[PDB]
Write a protein that binds this ligand. Structure first.
Ligand SMILES: [Ca+2]
Ligand SMILES: [Ca+2]
Ligand SMILES: [Ca+2]
Ligand SMILES: [Ca+2]
Ligand SMILES: [Ca+2]
Ligand SMILES: [Ca+2]
Ligand SMILES: [Ca+2]
Ligand SMILES: [Zn+2]
Length: 455
């Protein structure tokens, strides 16, 4: 039943209540984040692309906030800021072009170090201005007295702050009515339950407020609701990673937040992918992981909780677990699932899936007849007789499954294992109640015993 619960991991909307707060769906959160109804295309303009310019100020006549002690961006800030911009243009129909000299720009970057009174400010972090035609519109500012701001490449909060402020400069607002300086807001003030770093980088609250746990890390890229929100304003970018993309270990994304170079690296991201056959490669971790390929769902990767999610409108096809005891849940597409070492639970779901339990005592689960129809049957390519198991207990709801040796009686709800000596393939047939013909089939590359089947 671990599959059942995991499938409902972090359910939202549908009149639910989480943490005593109203639960919002991705779109409701996205609408809330774009409530200011402002973008670089104007007010109340949705689904329209934009070609924007950005500039690293070398000097200023004044900072629109009144803050003083201007300091230009250093090399590392410049590189990290470009990565943040890229994480936004990757998902929304936006293009960023740098301008220098006297040319004006839609989005600007600059640091400050003192307040209007001329006193050192080592307490604040950063802020930005919404798009518009007013003086300073789209400008973003950061406190140079903060080490995370000076070293955004080594201090994760810095990079996250860049992405956050750029979010404002693009038209995104905090999930709720609250802002630094104004009193002392908290998650208790959140308009909806999903107002945390787990769903939006535009939030003020840690992922822990929603049950997630990134072990002190900060994802520096747009999360699931941020993606929906930014696309609501500028449209989705359908040209991003349209080939076969691999996320996690052995990544070919050339994106730091989608890449893990070794087991000690933390992964925190919401994936946007516009095409191809893709893979969630989390093979380098030894932690027990829970991987869900359903769009909009969250996964527990590398020892963290709720650190990985799939954006709405995205189809990820494959997943590879680690040496831990994992749970891999596929989607309606044809998935290739690899559990790796450890005792894993694989659930292909709808579609013709190919499953590899890997080393260990693995379990291949089937929740219904639609999971492996004859017209699009599953393949279990490395089944180990007497070690792995095939769970068909879900069929009990319509009558306890009975085993038959070489013939079906017709009473339905019977399971048969057929050995193909010539090809060394075992065909698992299931004649379901209500079905006039045998419509369930799982082909197995290897031998299987009646005692390997759970009914
Ligand atoms: Ca892809
Ligand atoms: Ca895909
Ligand atoms: Ca495993
Ligand atoms: Ca599937
Ligand atoms: Ca395994
Ligand atoms: Ca196995
Ligand atoms: Ca299937
Ligand atoms: Zn903010």
């Amino acid at each position: 039943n671990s599959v059942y619960d995991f499938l409902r991991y972090h359910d939202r909307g549908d009149g639910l209540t989480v943490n005593g707060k109203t639960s919002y769906s991705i779109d409701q959160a996205a609408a809330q984040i774009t409530r200011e109804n402002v973008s670089w295309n104007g007010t109340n303009v949705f689904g329209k692309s934009a070609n924007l310019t950005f500039k690293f100020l070398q000097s200023v006549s004044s900072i629109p906030s009144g803050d003083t002690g201007f300091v230009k961006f250093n090399a590392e800030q410049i590189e990290q800021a470009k990565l943040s911009l890229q994480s936004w243009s990757d998902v929304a129909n936006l293009t960023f072009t740098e301008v220098t000299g006297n040319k004006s720009a839609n989005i600007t970057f600059g640091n400050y170090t003192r307040d209007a009174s001329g006193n050192l400010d080592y307490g604040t972090q950063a802020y930005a201005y919404y798009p518009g035609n007013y003086q300073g519109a789209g400008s973003s500012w950061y406190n140079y007295n903060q080490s995370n701001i000076r070293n955004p490449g080594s201090e994760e909060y810095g990079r996250q702050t860049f992405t956050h402020e750029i979010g404002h400069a693009l038209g995104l607002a905090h999930p709720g009515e609250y802002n630094a300086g104004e009193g002392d807001p908290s998650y208790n003030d959140a308009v909806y339950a999903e107002d945390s770093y787990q769903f939006s980088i535009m939030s003020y609250w840690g992922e822990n407020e929603t049950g997630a746990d990134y072990n002190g890390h900060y994802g520096g890229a747009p999360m699931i609701d941020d993606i929906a929100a930014i696309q609501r304003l500028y449209g989705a970018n359908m040209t991003t990673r349209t080939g076969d993309s691999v996320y996690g270990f052995n990544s070919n994304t050339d994106r730091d937040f989608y890449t893990a170079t070794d087991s000690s690296k933390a992964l925190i991201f919401s994936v946007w992918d516009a095409g191809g056959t893709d893979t969630f490669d989390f093979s380098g971790y030894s932690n027990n992981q829970r991987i869900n390929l359903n769009e909009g769902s969250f996964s527990d990767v590398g020892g963290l909780k709720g650190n990985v999610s799939i954006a709405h409108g995205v189809t990820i096809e494959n997943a590879i677990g680690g040496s831990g005891n994992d749970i891999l849940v596929g989607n309606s597409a044809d998935n290739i699932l690899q559990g790796g070492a450890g005792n894993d639970v694989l659930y292909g779901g709808a579609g013709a899936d190919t499953l590899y339990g890997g080393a260990g005592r693995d379990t291949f689960v089937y929740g219904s007849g639609q999971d492996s129809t004859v017209a699009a049957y599953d393949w279990i390519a490395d089944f180990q007789k007497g070690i792995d198991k095939i769970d068909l207990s879900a069929f009990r709801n319509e009558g306890q499954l009975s085993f038959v040796q070489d013939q079906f009686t017709g009473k339905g709800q019977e399971v048969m294992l057929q050995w193909d000596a010539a090809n060394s393939i075992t065909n698992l047939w299931l004649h379901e109640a209500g079905h006039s013909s045998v419509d369930f089939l799982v082909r197995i590359v290897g031998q299987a015993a009646q005692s390997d089947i759970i009914v």
